[PDB]
Amino acid sequence: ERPTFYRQELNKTIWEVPERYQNLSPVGSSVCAAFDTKTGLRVAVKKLSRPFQSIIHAKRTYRELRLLKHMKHENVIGLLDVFTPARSLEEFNDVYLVTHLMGADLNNIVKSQKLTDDHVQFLIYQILRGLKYIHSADIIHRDLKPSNLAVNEDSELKILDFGATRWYRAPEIMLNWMHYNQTVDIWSVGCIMAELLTGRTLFPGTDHIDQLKLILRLVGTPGAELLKKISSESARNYIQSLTQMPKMNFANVFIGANPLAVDLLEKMLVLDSDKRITAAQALAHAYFAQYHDPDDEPVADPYDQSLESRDLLIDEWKSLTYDEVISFVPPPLD
Numbered sequence: 001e002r003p004t005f006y007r008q009e010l011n012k013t014i015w016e017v018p019e020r021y022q023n024l025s026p027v028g029s030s031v032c033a034a035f036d037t038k039t040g041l042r043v044a045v046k047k048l049s050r051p052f053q054s055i056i057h058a059k060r061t062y063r064e065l066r067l068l069k070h071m072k073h074e075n076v077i078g079l080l081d082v083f084t085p086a087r088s089l090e091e092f093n094d095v096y097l098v099t100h101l102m103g104a105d106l107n108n109i110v111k112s113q114k115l116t117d118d119h120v121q122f123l124i125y126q127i128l129r130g131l132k133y134i135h136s137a138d139i140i141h142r143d144l145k146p147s148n149l150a151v152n153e154d155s156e157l158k159i160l161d162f163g164a165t166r167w168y169r170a171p172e173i174m175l176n177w178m179h180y181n182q183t184v185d186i187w188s189v190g191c192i193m194a195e196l197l198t199g200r201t202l203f204p205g206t207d208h209i210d211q212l213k214l215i216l217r218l219v220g221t222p223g224a225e226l227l228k229k230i231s232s233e234s235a236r237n238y239i240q241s242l243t244q245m246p247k248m249n250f251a252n253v254f255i256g257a258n259p260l261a262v263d264l265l266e267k268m269l270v271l272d273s274d275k276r277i278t279a280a281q282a283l284a285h286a287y288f289a290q291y292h293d294p295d296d297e298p299v300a301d302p303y304d305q306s307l308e309s310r311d312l313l314i315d316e317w318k319s320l321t322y323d324e325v326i327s328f329v330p331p332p333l334d
């Protein structure tokens with residue numbers, strides 16, 4: 001049965017939310033923090049900004065809703081509800097999405113500070129547990145950084161995507177290589193992990209060249225095996241035109257760090273992506289012996305990327321989105 005809605009104005013915009021959600025307060029752009037009374041959880045409610053104004057906005061609205069409907073895992077963000085005040089497609093013009101309100105991001109939790117080895121273990125273990133799921137769905141995050149990592153007081157973590165940044169991106173992404181695989185996320189984790197242990201940004205670049213200048217200093221200049229894989233002539237010509245760097249010994253970079261954490265970093269921060277560890281592989285690594293459980297690191301039913309990359313008319317995205325809203329099954333209660 002259709003819930004009774006209530007109208008309230010917040011943040012230069014009218015909001016029509018069901019009775020369920022209470023004490024709506026703006027947290028930034030539009031999203032409000034709120035209390036859900038059916039479940040008892042504090043929730044974040046995002047109103048989709050101008051959803052069907054352009055083809056892009058509409059295509060973008062559908063992608064999010066679908067993807068998040070399919071995302072059902074504890075270390076990946078999910079949907080507690082999705083709703084519209086529309087009683088009919090022809091009056092359909094706004095979309096709201098709901099999830100557990102989350103305390104802080106990985107900067108806010110504790111970033112500037114040097115976390116303990118046991119604590120780092122738990123966090124990285126979780127990211128990896130989430131990445132296994134997202135990857136099995138054939139999805140690549142492409143933008144893993146701490147500001148995309150939601151974490152409560154208990155330090156339970158969920159991966160998310162907010163639709164300095166350049167510090168965590170795989171080298172190939174900076175060089176605008178336009179074929180890449182899932183291990184660009186493994187690089188990001190590598191960086192995130194290095195930081196958690198040291199309290200220090202691994203690669204605190206000032207611009208794009210500086211960024212790659214820094215990355216090479218740690219991992220070394222590309223070997224003749226990697227050299228053979230660069231497609232672009234000009235690019236190859238430039239890599240030759242560099243002074244040879246030796247791979248820095250990680251032991252000396254991460255002084256006194258648990259050498260299990262070092263070996264793991266060795267395996268993530270590998271310039272050639274084909275040889276980086278996979279999320280699945282990393283969960284098996286001794287470093288997470290105190291957390292790893294192969295019977296509870298589940299995968300996703302595979303996901304249709306091709307459905308979100310289409311030349312559709314406005315009304316066609318609007319109707320496919322509406323259908324998704326109608327077809328929404330909430331997750332079973334606690």
Ligand SMILES: CC(C)(C)c1cc(NC(=O)Nc2nc(CCOCc3ccccc3)cs2)n(-c2ccc(CC(=O)O)cc2)n1
Nearest residue numbers: 031044045046060063064067097098099159160161162163
């Ligand atoms: C699953 C994974 C990480 C791949 C993922 C997760 C998300 N989505 C996501 O992170 N959403 C978030 N939004 C905020 C700010 C708003 O308040 C939170 C909030 C309140 C209520 C409900 C949800 C969120 C923080 S986290 N995308 C994603 C997919 C498509 C697009 C569209 C495009 O393609 O541009 C953009 C992102 N991919």
Ligand SMILES: CCCCCCCCO[C@@H]1O[C@H](CO)[C@@H](O)[C@H](O)[C@H]1O
Nearest residue numbers: 171172179180181229271272273274
């Ligand atoms: C400064 C020069 C550093 C080059 C960094 C990019 C090398 C990353 O590795 C490359 O990743 C590509 C994209 O996934 C793959 O197609 C290649 O197989 C792999 O060699």
